[PDB]
Design a protein around this ligand. Sequence first.
Ligand SMILES: *[C@@H]1O[C@H](CO)[C@@H](O[C@@H]2O[C@H](CO)[C@@H](O[C@@H]3O[C@H](CO[C@H]4O[C@H](CO[C@H]5O[C@H](CO)[C@@H](O)[C@H](O)[C@@H]5O)[C@@H](O)[C@H](O[C@H]5O[C@H](CO)[C@@H](O)[C@H](O)[C@@H]5O)[C@@H]4O)[C@@H](O)[C@H](O)[C@@H]3O)[C@H](O)[C@H]2NC(C)=O)[C@H](O)[C@H]1NC(C)=O
Ligand SMILES: *[C@@H]1O[C@H](CO)[C@@H](O[C@@H]2O[C@H](CO)[C@@H](O)[C@H](O)[C@H]2NC(C)=O)[C@H](O)[C@H]1NC(C)=O
Ligand SMILES: *[C@@H]1O[C@H](CO)[C@@H](O)[C@H](O)[C@H]1NC(C)=O
Ligand SMILES: *[C@@H]1O[C@H](CO)[C@@H](O)[C@H](O)[C@H]1NC(C)=O
Ligand SMILES: *[C@@H]1O[C@H](CO)[C@@H](O)[C@H](O)[C@H]1NC(C)=O
Ligand SMILES: *[C@@H]1O[C@H](CO)[C@@H](O)[C@H](O)[C@H]1NC(C)=O
Ligand SMILES: *[C@@H]1O[C@H](CO)[C@@H](O)[C@H](O)[C@H]1NC(C)=O
Lengths: 219, 219
Amino acid sequence: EISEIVVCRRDLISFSFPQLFSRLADENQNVSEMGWIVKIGNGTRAHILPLKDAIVQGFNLLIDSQKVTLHVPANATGIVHYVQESSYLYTVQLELLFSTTGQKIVFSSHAICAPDLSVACNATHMTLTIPEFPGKLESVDFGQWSIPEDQWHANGIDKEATNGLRLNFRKSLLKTKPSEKCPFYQFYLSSLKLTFYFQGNMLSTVIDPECHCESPVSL
Amino acid sequence: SEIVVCRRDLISFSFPQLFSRLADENQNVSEMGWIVKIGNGTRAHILPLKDAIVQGFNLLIDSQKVTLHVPANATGIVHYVQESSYLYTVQLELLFSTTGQKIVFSSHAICAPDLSVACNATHMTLTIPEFPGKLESVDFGQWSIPEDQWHANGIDKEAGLRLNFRKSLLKTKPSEKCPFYQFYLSSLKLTFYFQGNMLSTVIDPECHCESPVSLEHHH
Ligand SMILES: *[C@@H]1O[C@H](CO)[C@@H](O[C@@H]2O[C@H](CO)[C@@H](O[C@@H]3O[C@H](CO[C@H]4O[C@H](CO[C@H]5O[C@H](CO)[C@@H](O)[C@H](O)[C@@H]5O)[C@@H](O)[C@H](O[C@H]5O[C@H](CO)[C@@H](O)[C@H](O)[C@@H]5O)[C@@H]4O)[C@@H](O)[C@H](O)[C@@H]3O)[C@H](O)[C@H]2NC(C)=O)[C@H](O)[C@H]1NC(C)=O
Ligand SMILES: *[C@@H]1O[C@H](CO)[C@@H](O[C@@H]2O[C@H](CO)[C@@H](O)[C@H](O)[C@H]2NC(C)=O)[C@H](O)[C@H]1NC(C)=O
Ligand SMILES: *[C@@H]1O[C@H](CO)[C@@H](O)[C@H](O)[C@H]1NC(C)=O
Ligand SMILES: *[C@@H]1O[C@H](CO)[C@@H](O)[C@H](O)[C@H]1NC(C)=O
Ligand SMILES: *[C@@H]1O[C@H](CO)[C@@H](O)[C@H](O)[C@H]1NC(C)=O
Ligand SMILES: *[C@@H]1O[C@H](CO)[C@@H](O)[C@H](O)[C@H]1NC(C)=O
Ligand SMILES: *[C@@H]1O[C@H](CO)[C@@H](O)[C@H](O)[C@H]1NC(C)=O
């Protein structure tokens, strides 16, 4: 269903599009008679940049025969930010345009990044808080298969809407790892995929939530 | 770069694939995913290719070229009739789309195949209906004669719009249509400052056929 690869990173979101019908080369930028434009956001909230200015801001465009990759700084204007109860998620609606005389090629993708979700843990459960945003959670995938809502409870997943969206996981589902940051171990999940009904489509985010200590150690 | 061919009942747009290879052998292409738009802004009439084909549009493609035939009765064409002279414009956007990628071919044609053409002893005279185009250049072949040189080169403007050409600028030929000879021009390009842009029409204006004198024969 999805062909581009979206990766949320610390300071950066990477979009990689395959060249299904385009024949663009790395040379075809910063050259006469052709131009790249980066748009982030929707409608009047959409922020438009010529590639030159975007490069100055820390964007990077990479092209080879197989794919077109755009690295987007997480503070790019047009990103929509959702903070609630110290939990943080943001969305990136990208349109990347190559234009020549009488022709345009447009790569489109809408990313959900949620590295700073608030994660609380007690004796029996891990609890994620997901800020309210246009996405409605419809599936949770630990790796093997995509668990729909009507099967969450049986598989140890419990949703609570008393405030915002709290997603609970039985401690039995959690992995353990040693840690020197939250001494001397912490529970966590690896490559948890959350899928949302987001503005009429299915869109996922991948996260590695870990329980947090009140005061962690760091030098 | 695109080729626009205006006929009475049909306008042909042929686009090169300079930076794409859409419809190459490793791809399967269908009428699905194609959209035809004719007109500007909210006057643009949008058809899926399936419906446009019903109406008499025709799309033919290979990896090197994309050709769209647009019926002259297409919804969205702007029609200009004045003083028995007829000119019309076709603002085309042709889109091929996948879920995350699209290519858009754009061209704005000015067609005047049925422009009214009158000729007398000394001049050919074209009548151009009033429309958003301001005539700025006339190109017979080699170079684009701007307004400030028209009079010197035998071109005189008269006011919707009458454009006079001294007969010295005209070619002559016999034809099965005009067995003696006729004055004419081939691939005359008129260039207009059109809504902040440059737009041209190419036309083949012809005088009525010349009349030969009777020859007496055997008696
Ligand atoms: C076939 O059709 C022709 C047009 O459809 C028609 O030509 C017109 O005929 C009338 C009546 O005979 C003439 O009327 C006379 O006009 C002059 C005006 O002087 C000049 O006008 C034009 C262009 O003027 C341009 O001037 C500035 C720069 O100076 C430009 O920016 C701008 O383009 C203006 O339009 C010019 O062509 C004239 O040319 C002269 O020289 C030739 C040489 O043989 C002559 O043939 C021509 O008749 C004229 O003498 C001239 O420089 C005015 O002073 C008079 O009092 C009179 O009113 C039009 O000028 C003439 N127009 C053109 C473009 O030729 C033909 O008459 C018609 N033929 C028949 C048989 O019906
Ligand atoms: C650990 O936290 C979870 C959720 O954050 C608590 O689970 C809920 O507890 C309330 C009562 O406090 C019940 O009404 C809900 O049905 C529980 N939901 C789930 C999914 O278990 C749990 O009680 C907390 N445990 C402790 C010891 O505080
Ligand atoms: C996005 O912008 C378009 C205008 O380009 C508007 O019609 C649409 O309602 C916007 N979507 C949202 C969710 O605001
Ligand atoms: C935005 O992020 C870039 C790196 O992605 C960084 O260099 C820059 O200082 C940041 N600007 C602000 C205002 O945070
Ligand atoms: C086109 O579709 C056919 C099925 O009708 C499939 O067998 C073939 O592999 C496709 N061609 C290419 C080049 O992918
Ligand atoms: C063409 O449409 C755009 C909106 O797509 C509008 O802003 C503009 O005014 C229109 N131009 C003309 C000449 O009507
Ligand atoms: C429009 O013109 C095309 C030919 O260019 C023809 O096939 C079609 O029937 C015409 N439509 C109408 C409504 O006359």
